[PDB]
Design a protein around this ligand. Sequence first.
Ligand SMILES: COc1cc(CCN)cc(OC)c1OC
Length: 263
Amino acid sequence: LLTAVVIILTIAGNILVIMAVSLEKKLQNATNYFLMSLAIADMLLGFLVMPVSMLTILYGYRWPLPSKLCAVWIYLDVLFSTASIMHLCAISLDRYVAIQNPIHHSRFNSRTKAFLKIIAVWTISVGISMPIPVFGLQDDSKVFKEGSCLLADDNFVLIGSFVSFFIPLTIMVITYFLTIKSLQKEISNEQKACKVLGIVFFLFVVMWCPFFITNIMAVICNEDVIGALLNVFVWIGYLSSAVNPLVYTLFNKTYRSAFSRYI
Ligand SMILES: COc1cc(CCN)cc(OC)c1OC
């Protein structure tokens, strides 16, 4: 099956990134520590969540797993997906701040800033993903629907899709536009950086955008077609966790050398 390839690529990429950060003396700085935290989140998703979804695919969408375990499963899904999304948003904000005024960025570029950023993004993701365990375990009807298990809370879906992908999307759009308008004011290094930023932004938009917009159209509005579209797009969005470890690292020569050495 095609879904078994994605889990293999996710875990392979995150192992390679983790060993590249940990076993290299030159890559150990704040940015690669934030990237390591992102890789940790993507590994936790691709280890605890995606094989369960593959078992759901194989089992005909009746839930073999315990019912109570589905609510915590949705909790882990939302937790790790939000963690990845605001990790990318914080990466984009840090890139814009470091590119617009590089002198003032180096005055406060210690490891304390990176630790505070990691703490902030994980606390934000935990707070966003907080109600699913508390309300889903008390009432089983809020997470189950005719054997299949999905978020049946419409208002929670709207709020947690507006605060997790419609604030970060506009933040990333604004920072990408401003970073493009900042580097163009000045040179193959800057053009290569612009190409990399554009590739990253458009890959993120292409990978993640259809899932949230069809999730919104599922609730705000033919049910089988929308359900199948959400079914395909939630697996398309899982492919982004196997792409961010590669794209954010392979543009460096040291990362390419380390990945060729370790394999
Ligand atoms: C918070 O954003 C979400 C992120 C995912 C990631 C799914 N792989 C699923 C959701 O609903 C279950 C979300 O809330 C609507």
